[PDB]
Structure 1
Amino acid sequence: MEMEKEFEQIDKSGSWAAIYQDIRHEASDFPSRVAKLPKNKNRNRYRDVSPFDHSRIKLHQEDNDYINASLIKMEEAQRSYILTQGPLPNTVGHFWEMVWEQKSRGVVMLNRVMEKGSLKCAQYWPQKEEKEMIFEDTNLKLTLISEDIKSYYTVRQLELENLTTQETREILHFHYTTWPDFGVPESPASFLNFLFKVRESGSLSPEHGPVVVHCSAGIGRSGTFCLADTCLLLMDKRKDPSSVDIKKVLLEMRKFRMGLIQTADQLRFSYLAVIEGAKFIM
């Protein structure tokens, strides 16, 4: 396998940091003017992570249409993803408005609410069936329907009601709960198993709106998830699977959201996953 070769060459030469910096150097730079307006300062978790204006998701309201979320459209793979930050106390209602307006079936969460002893995102979904959440600012109701807790992830069935029209939809919550506080997982086996469960649900399929994916910033773990999915999909589509260039897919994705893959260890882990997941379809 070519990727596993380029892989062994970088490992033996210990040049992961050098590859990663070349990607950082070649990555696209587009304006983020709406993100930086003073009215939007409390809608942004991190000062240095912003959606580009050309690819930002717009909320359907006249007041303020701004959320820290981007549409990543992969033309050849025929996949779309919305990458977004972990919701803030004042953006939980915007988050669910976006899920509603964009017709998403699935939410993918790659972080714990608390990590390293700090809050990484708001408790944005209900933890008990009989204690539903109402978002008065966006006129939505969210109810926990069921919860399936496994060793590496939890799947939840949620009901989202538009209180304005009384339509309801089922949203699936896929929560990967075992990403370590520091570094990346030692094996990609549990991450690939999780990706295959999201795919099996129909959440990634063209009959729905784009899947919503987040971690804390929505660029690191979130980038790893959509890079691995797209590379595996291209490998099954192209006549020469060996032609799939992970660095080139990543730069394409970086035209839509800045900073995807935050460390050289995340880049190496992405290779391992696409290598392992491929070596499993073969």
Structure 2
Amino acid sequence: MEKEFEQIDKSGSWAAIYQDIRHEASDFPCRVAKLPKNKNRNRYRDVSPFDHSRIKLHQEDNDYINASLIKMEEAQRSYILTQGPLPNTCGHFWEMVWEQKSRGVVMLNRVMLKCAQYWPQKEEKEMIFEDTNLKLTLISEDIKSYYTVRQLELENLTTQETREILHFHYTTWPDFGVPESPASFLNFLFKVRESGSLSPEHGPVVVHSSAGIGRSGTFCLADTCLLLMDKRKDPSSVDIKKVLLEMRKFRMGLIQTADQLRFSYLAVIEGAKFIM
């Protein structure tokens, strides 16, 4: 399957292959995302959850967040892909994490102005979201060369229940851009895996980036292809293009560039050297 990459790379036809996928992509209504009232709940006019797959906040007021549940049946893995929270939607965001029983949050964009800072910078400075009634405290953070992992405590003030959330932040990935190498990213991925944040025991991990489509789509596409190869009887059968289009049924626009598409291949290619 490496060869297929070799065929596109040598052809230098990557832009075309990305366009094929785009044409072949799903389309579904986005009636709620487009509601006049939800206008400021979306970071981008051009990026919206399909109505069928959108996550619903369970609190009475309004049930809308710009998030999509991606369900991959064969791989038995689920992802929530969402836009980087707006200053108004932080409360909503944390509510979705509580309600969906998520143990992990994967962030693939730098704060630089792509996304609000929705988590506590200091332990001493915990956050309260009065709209959704959630208190968030930063327990601990470990900073590394390529990424940061933080341990947070999200407490539902209503129920006085507590949950430990692990925050995984890839800090070296530029917007609309690709990391210099797949291994740094793959290492990031296994760290996320190792933590169990992707276990079926827990709710679907929340993955986000600025738009919640390109960087995030790469992370999810990569993990799934690699999962499939492990699970499957013949690993050679796994087709990235097939996998990407299945995900795009759940959320529009996953993987935004030809450059991202090439990277997913490289990452998946390098990733399965490891698994194998």
User: TM-score, normalised on structure 2?
Assistant: 0.99
Counterpart position of 2:264: 270
Counterpart CA distance in 2 for 1:281 and 1:263 is: 27
Q: Residue by residue, what CA displacement relative to the aligned partner does 1:169-193 show, whole Å, maximum 9, x if unpaired?
A: 0000000001135631121010000
Displacement of 1:89 in angstroms is 0.5
Alpha-carbon distance between aligned partners in 1 of 2:36 and 2:275, rounded to the nearest angstrom? 49
- Distance in 2 of aligned mates of 1:231 and 1:179: 21
Distance in 2, Cα, partners of 1:213 & 1:15: 30
Contact 2:110 2:174 in 1 (8 A): no
User: 1:194, CA displacement in angstroms?
Assistant: 0.3
Per-residue Cα deviation, 1:20-70 (whole angstroms, up to 9, x for no partner): 000000100000000000010000000000000000000012221000000
Could you tell me how far 1:279 is from its partner in structure 2?
A: 1.4
Q: Which residue of 106, 112, 130 maps to 2:124?
A: 130
How far apart, in 1, do the equivalents of 2:158 and 2:142 lie? 30
Distance verdict in 2 for CA 1:261–1:181, change over 3 Å? closer
Distance 1:203 1:21 in 2: 33
CA–CA separation in structure 1 for the residues paired with 2:253 and 2:23: 11
Cross-structure match for 1:214: 208
Taking the aligned partners of 1:167 and 1:245, their CA distance within structure 2 comes to 42
Q: Secondary structure at the match of 2:15?
A: helix
Q: Of residues 148, 155, 179 in structure 1, which corresponds to 2:149?
A: 155
Tell me the alpha carbon deviations over residues 89-142 of structure 1, each in whole angstroms, 9 at most, x when there is no partner: 10000000000000000000001111xxxx111110001011100000001000
Alpha-carbon distance in 2 for matches of 1:6, 1:31? 34
Q: Measure how far apart 1:165 and its partner are.
A: 1.3
| Ranges in structure 1 where 5+ consecutive residues have no aligned partner | none
Measure the CA separation in 2 of the matches of 1:70 and 1:91.
15
SS in 1 for 2:249: coil
Deviations 1:221-277 (A, max 9, x none): 000000000000000111110000000000000000000000000000000000001
Report the secondary structure of 2:180's partner residue: coil
Structure 1 stretches of 4+ moved >3 Å: none
Could you say if the C-alpha distance between residues 220 and 182 of structure 1 is closer, same or farther in structure 2, counting changes exceeding 3 Å? closer
Q: In the aligned structure 2, how far is the partner of 1:38 from the partner of 1:91?
A: 16
Counterparts of 1:172 and 1:109 in 2: how far apart (Å)? 11
Q: CA separation in 2, counterparts of 1:36 and 1:183?
A: 28
Aligned length: 276
Describe the superposition over 1:154-173 as per-residue Cα deviations: whole angstroms up to 9, x where unpaired: 10000001111110100000
Q: Aligned partners of 2:58 and 2:134: how far apart in 1?
A: 14
CA RMSD of superposed structures (Å): 0.7
- How many Å separate the matches in 2 of 1:185 and 1:237? 28
**1:281 Cα shift?**
1.8
Deviation string, structure 1 residues 195-233 (Cα, Å, up to 9, x no partner) = 000000010000100000000000000000000000000
User: What is the 5 A alignment of 1:1-282?
Assistant: 3-114=1-112, 119-181=113-175, 183-282=177-276
Give the TM-score taking structure 1 as reference length: 0.97
Aligned mates of 1:59, 1:275 — CA distance in 2? 37
The percent of aligned pairs where both chains have the same amino acid is: 99
- Give the unaligned 5+ runs of structure 2: none
2:175 and 2:200 map into 1 onto residues whose CA distance is 34
